[PDB]
């Protein structure tokens, strides 16, 4: 019976109304104490982005600073949250520390920035856009269950503090003021739609950058939708990760149950 | 009269013998005092790479360490030099410092590494692979002329020390021990075959990483072969560069006559 209100916004790329209706219906049926509020800005489009940087920033702060909501759930995680994150940090109020923030992929930019300042709770979790996947209700109900108080969706190695990032997003965040101090943390990674040489390039960069950071180690989640018409790279993605972790002196801790897929598990930062 | 001997190797991706014959033929007709030697490794093939990491590294060192050559010219610049650059450094002999090293794109990895350690001279310049372009002789002829002693191929703003990098290569090198101290340098960038959102991501990362480096400023070269079927991004590459430079307090100095094209000018590092 205890109710909970969740705000949804589009820090980068846009959603559609019919798909939000689907998410609302699922929650109504399966999590009747949750209440979802999709900000109108979820549905704005200027092409790539869900409105201008000013509009995306504005909608995020409206959600984040409204104490009517216990969570902000990022609707979609295409490129672009880096254009609001720094400005957002300067304008977050007290309400914003009493919230949790949930999503994955580029939205990880916001997860990182909030965690770097200990604002609320940052949580890697499936997003409303996952409703579009085959069996995507399974992903969306994982996050809704989490918001309703269930813990079954936690990534099973959890129980060393953890962060989870999309590999490209982490590479972008390295060397910036948006990355938290990852010393003593397990860093879990996943990737989608990148060539094997691009995954190698990213691993080289991220492992090089984190070599001196004192992390607990790296876990490799799922690397998927790899283009299929390339010449053989010469080794597997796990071989690449182990190779670069060895060179950097970073412990390879094994795998993680995260990815751009409906089985993506929940990882609260820290 | 005086003969100048140039060794050519393939630090990442391979070349073909027919195309190498075309380069030699052009040099024979126009620069009779140049002597080109293509290492056999240029034509090795292990899927993506011009042979194994060990083979590529051995051929690079054979060229660099050989007294018979005044220069090492990188044959092509697809991904992979990062897998030989660090290991090469500890094995470079006395002769390696008496040479020029010339290439662009991924070969910039080696240009960076050698320049970071003041080994010889690093030069951004057209590569033998440019012969495959329409009017490709004009690119290759620029480098040959430079090797023969001409200076007309110099990028027209040169006369502050400069570097020139592929943007993705530079982004990859940020935070790694391979990047030179770029304090007081003009940094020229170019890019090929990246989405507009990808160029934005790279520019955010590079400017964020160089913000505290005290660079003299950035120059924007050509960004080309951009995917045509994306949604409107919302600003031009010049607007992206100016935006991120302003955020980082980096001087936007103007344009540079560099790019993945036959008009690509020569930029000696320093």
Q: Compute φ and ψ for B95, nearest 5 degrees.
A: -65, -30
CA distance B208 to A205: 15
Q: Which of residues 114 through 143 in chain A touch B, CB cutoff 8 A?
A: none
Q: Tell me which chain A residues have a C-beta less than 8 angstroms from the C-beta of B200.
A: 79
Q: Among A21, A131, A5, which Cα is nearest to A71's?
A: A5
A265: its two tokens:
């598990």
Question: Any chain A CB within 8 A of the CB of B197?
Answer: yes
Neighbours of A212 (CB within 10 A): 12
Query: Are B77 and B178 contained in the same domain?
Result: no
Question: Any chain A CB within 8 A of the CB of B205?
Answer: yes
CA distance B60 to A159: 48
Smallest CA–CA distance from A81 into chain B, residue:
B201
Contact A232 B208 (CB under 8 A): no
Query: Are B173 and B194 contained in the same domain?
Result: yes
Instruction: Output DSSP code: residue A67.
Output: T
Q: Among A266, A241, A270, A218, which Cα is nearest to A73's?
A: A266
Going through B142-232 in order, the beta strands assigned E by DSSP cover 162-166, 186-192, 217-224
| Mutation for B interface: A201, A229, A236, most B CBs within 10 A | A201
Query: Are A165 and A243 contained in the same domain?
Result: yes
CA distance A119 to A96: 7
A&B contacts, CB < 8 Å: 82
CA distance B181 to B269: 12
| Mutation for B interface: A56, A90, A171, A207, most B CBs within 10 A | A171
Query: Are A149 and A242 contained in the same domain?
Result: no
Query: Are B215 and B180 contained in the same domain?
Result: yes
Q: Tell me which chain A residues have a C-beta less than 8 angstroms from the C-beta of B196.
A: 48
Q: Tell me which chain B residues have a C-beta less than 8 angstroms from the C-beta of A79.
A: 197-198, 200-201
Q: Tell me which chain B residues have a C-beta less than 8 angstroms from the C-beta of A48.
A: 196-197, 230-234
- Count: domains in chain A: 2
Query: Residues, chain A, total?
Result: 270
CA distance A88 to A93: 10
Contact B172 A46 (CB under 8 A): no
CA distance A224 to B154: 44
CA distance A84 to A156: 32
Judge whether A217 and A244 are in contact, CB under 8 Å: no
**Alpha carbon of A246: minimum distance to chain B alpha carbons (Å):** 13
CA distance B237 to B51: 36
> What CA–CA distances, in Å, run from B54 to A235, B46, B59, B119?
15, 12, 9, 21
CA distance B70 to A78: 48
Contact A172 B46 (CB under 8 A): no
CA distance A132 to A221: 21
CA distance A59 to A64: 9
> What CA–CA distances, in Å, run from A155 to A145, A164, A188, A242, B228?
14, 10, 10, 21, 39
Q: Assign residue A39 the CATH number of its domain.
A: 3.40.50.10740
Q: B11 is in which domain, residue-wise?
A: 1-156+262-270
Give the resolution to one decimal, in Å. Answer: 1.9
Judge whether B270 and B118 are in contact, CB under 8 Å: no
Residues 6 or more apart from A149 whose CB is under 8 A from it?
Answer: none
Query: Are A103 and A163 contained in the same domain?
Result: no
Q: Compute φ and ψ for A205, nearest 5 degrees.
A: -65, -55
Q: Assign residue A177 the CATH number of its domain.
A: 3.50.30.60
CA distance A204 to B96: 26
CA distance B28 to B22: 10
Q: Tell me which chain B residues have a C-beta less than 8 angstroms from the C-beta of A86.
A: 247
B121: its two tokens:
């001279």
Q: Experimental method for this entry?
A: X-ray
**Alpha carbon of B51: minimum distance to chain A alpha carbons (Å):** 10
Query: Are A177 and A267 contained in the same domain?
Result: no
**Alpha carbon of A94: minimum distance to chain B alpha carbons (Å):** 26
Contact B209 A175 (CB under 8 A): yes
Burial A221-236 (b: 16+ CB within 10 A, else e): bbbeebeeeeeebbee
Going through B10-166 in order, the beta strands assigned E by DSSP cover 34-38, 71-74, 100-103, 121-124, 162-166
DSSP element (H, E) containing B220: strand B217-224
Query: Are A216 and A123 contained in the same domain?
Result: no
Query: Are B85 and B168 contained in the same domain?
Result: no
Query: Are B13 and B82 contained in the same domain?
Result: yes
Contact A174 B171 (CB under 8 A): no
Question: Any chain A CB within 8 A of the CB of B231?
Answer: yes
Query: Are A138 and A187 contained in the same domain?
Result: no
Question: Any chain A CB within 8 A of the CB of B230?
Answer: yes
Contact B175 A209 (CB under 8 A): yes
Q: Which of residues 48 through 77 in chain A touch B, CB cutoff 8 A?
A: 48-49, 52
Q: Compute φ and ψ for A171, nearest 5 degrees.
A: -60, -40
CA distance A138 to A144: 10
Query: Are B150 and B163 contained in the same domain?
Result: no
**Alpha carbon of B240: minimum distance to chain A alpha carbons (Å):** 11
């Amino acid at each position: 019976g205890m109710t909970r209100r969740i705000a949804i916004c589009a820090p980068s790329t846009p959603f559609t109304r019919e798909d939000s209706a689907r998410v609302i219906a699922l929650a109504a049926a399966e999590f009747p104490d949750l209440s979802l509020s999709f900000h109108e800005q979820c549905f704005a489009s200027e092409g790539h982005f869900a409105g201008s940087d000013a509009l995306r920033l504005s909608a995020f702060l409206e959600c984040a600073n409204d104490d009517a909501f216990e969570a902000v759930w990022f609707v979609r995680g295409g490129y672009g949250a880096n254009r609001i994150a720094e400005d957002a940090l300067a304008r977050l109020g007290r309400a914003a520390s009493a919230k949790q923030y949930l999503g994955y992929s580029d939205a990880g930019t916001l997860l990182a920035a909030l965690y770097a300042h200990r604002i609320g709770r940052s949580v890697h979790a499936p997003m409303p856009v996952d409703i579009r996947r085959p069996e995507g209700e399974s992903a969306v109900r994982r996050t809704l269950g989490w918001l309703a108080g269930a813990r079954e969706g936690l990534e099973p190695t959890l129980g060393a503090p953890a962060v989870a990032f999309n590999l490209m997003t982490l590479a972008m965040l390295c060397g910036t003021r948006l990355l938290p101090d990852l010393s003593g943390h397990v860093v879990m990674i996943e990737e989608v739609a990148e060539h094997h040489y691009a995954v190698d390039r990213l691993l080289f960069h991220v492992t090089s950058c984190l070599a001196d950071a004192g992390i607990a180690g790296l876990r490799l989640g799922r690397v998927s939708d790899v283009p299929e018409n390339d010449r053989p790279f010469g080794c597997s993605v796990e071989e690449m990760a182990r190779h670069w972790c060895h060179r950097a002196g970073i412990a390879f801790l094994g795998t993680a149950d995260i990815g751009h897929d409906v089985d993506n598990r929940i990882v609260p930062f820290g």
